[PDB]
Design brief:
Chain A: It is found in: Host cytoplasm; Host Golgi apparatus; Host nucleus. The structure is a homodimer. With 298 residues, chain A is of the alpha+beta class. Chain A has helices spanning 9-12, 52-57, 199-211, 225-234, 242-247, 249-255, 259-272, 291-296; strands spanning 15-20, 23-30, 33-37, 65-68, 71-73, 75-81, 84-89, 99-101, 109-116, 119-127, 146-151, 154-164, 170-173. The complex binds the ligand COc1cccc2[nH]c(C(=O)N[C@@H](CC(C)C)C(=O)N[C@@H](C[C@@H]3CCNC3=O)C(=O)c3nc4ccccc4s3)cc12 (2 copies).
Amino acid sequence: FRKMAFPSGKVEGCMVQVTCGTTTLNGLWLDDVVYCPRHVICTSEDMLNPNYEDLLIRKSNHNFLVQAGNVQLRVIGHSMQNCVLKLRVDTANPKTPKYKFVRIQPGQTFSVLACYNGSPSGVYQCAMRPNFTIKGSFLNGSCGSVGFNIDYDCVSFCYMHHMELPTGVHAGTDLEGNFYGPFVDRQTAQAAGTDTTITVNVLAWLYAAVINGDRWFLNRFTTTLNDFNLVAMKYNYEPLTQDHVDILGPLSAQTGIAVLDMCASLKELLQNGMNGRTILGSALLEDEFTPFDVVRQC
Amino acid sequence: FRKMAFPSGKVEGCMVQVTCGTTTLNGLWLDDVVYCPRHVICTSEDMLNPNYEDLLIRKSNHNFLVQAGNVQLRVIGHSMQNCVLKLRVDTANPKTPKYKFVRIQPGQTFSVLACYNGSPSGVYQCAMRPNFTIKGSFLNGSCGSVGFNIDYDCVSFCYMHHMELPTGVHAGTDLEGNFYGPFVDRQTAQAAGTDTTITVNVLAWLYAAVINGDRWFLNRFTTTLNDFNLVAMKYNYEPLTQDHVDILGPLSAQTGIAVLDMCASLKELLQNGMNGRTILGSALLEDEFTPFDVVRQCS
Ligand SMILES: COc1cccc2[nH]c(C(=O)N[C@@H](CC(C)C)C(=O)N[C@@H](C[C@@H]3CCNC3=O)C(=O)c3nc4ccccc4s3)cc12
Ligand SMILES: COc1cccc2[nH]c(C(=O)N[C@@H](CC(C)C)C(=O)N[C@@H](C[C@@H]3CCNC3=O)C(=O)c3nc4ccccc4s3)cc12
């Protein structure tokens, strides 16, 4: 089991660059609209606390340079939606895939296509942390890179990149420009909440272990959901939701291990430790594999 | 800092499905040729001891069903180059990138595009182990998936996938059909040579960990090149060459830590352990990042 991104080609066909003055960020070109972070209109002096509405009233369609490679796409309209800019262009992207905009939940994973001046540079899988950061790899000029999942040739875009916190993790928005977590698009030092372990993903990891014959940790106990949640919080693990119980369903069916029985097994792991014994060859409990990831890799 | 793969679009547009009889695997469509593992011709009986030139001479052009998406491409010629079959089709692939076929060295990395039935499924980064295996993620039907590097719009193909060892590591060939390692395309349980750790990569990775603001493992000591190799070889690490020292220069210059200083650091980590602490979140020393990988990602 290793971290596996989705193939990036459908997304690559949509990466463009958007320039205002000398600031160039990445943008996403779908049909005749280009989506990009709104602070591309920011001057260096205007970033400590920008008045975006005032800054945008001064801009015109001809102030925006949108380029697919070195080819210019003429802007014919602009509007702001939360923290993203929506630039209407005169050409429908012929490489537009079937697509959706979705807001993901903590614990869900997605692939990030790291881009610079519109050129793709790399692809990797990320997990949204419970404190709404992602442990990404982003340099200067990466803003506007997107994160995504592909189900049956349809690309669900879920992330657009905006910021690196002082701790080195990263923060961004969905494709409607709404931040994940309590961050804002200002050149300020912001702190995320304390992070926690993604319980639903650890349980999926335990199911993967069982599937592969590693099952020493299975006990004869069960628990109620509420009892497990109260114990999980004491170990800085996320509480389980009903949605978490449901997405663990296929793995529970495949192994014949009830979700609450597996919760009692993890509960014993938290209270008593791993005893130098390993699970899937590891002494640490992995938490960035979703139940879909586990099913994908099997 | 994360295991990062090349964007896979240029390769995706080349992946097709190839069918002979009851067998289906993936092929690579470049210009007017499709490359795939030769044992797509093997029936279940053939697989234990296939006489490949004999099995292939008894196949005609119309025995091969090549599908590109929903379209079928017509095979108009075929030949075998070692463990790879080359099917000449009557249609050129317009999405053919600029490309080259290369044979990587152990310790080098590449991106794998895992495919099933000619459909791309996932992309992740692999390293050619010293024992010529790769720790990949491959299932039934993945044969014919390829590994590659990219360098300014030029795709350097280096690996085509052929098998999973009983230990779960993977084995395959370059695009000339020659295996990496002592393996052979027959249906048998095969063991690899004893693996060792890619030392130059571990060092590159500790530099990456310092560029990302983690330094707990550093120390005051230095070591000589030979004294480090003595300890390294004792722990089943590959020897470090002066070329490797040079290759690590840019990372040494950036962080101002001399290579043999970092070698002293690694030597202590090997003799004392990690004492339950982690480096870049990992509990184990990582050796699947080359010096080029860390530089490309960090700068
Ligand atoms: C004293 O202020 C701080 C104190 C402590 C930590 C801090 N972090 C940031 C911060 O992140 N700012 C945002 C920008 C804000 C407006 C969202 C930002 O630079 N995003 C980067 C991606 C960054 C850069 C390095 N790799 C990361 O992912 C990006 O691509 C963009 N470049 C520009 C250039 C010009 C105009 C717009 C953009 S948007 C500020 C900051
Ligand atoms: C007693 O024999 C064993 C004992 C102990 C461990 C073993 N491993 C293998 C072994 O790997 N076989 C080869 C096939 C050989 C001929 C190269 C193989 O590649 N199958 C897959 C990829 C595999 C499968 C699971 N994930 C891996 O990546 C593939 O795509 C192909 N399927 C077929 C099906 C029919 C014809 C050609 C191909 S080629 C045999 C074996």
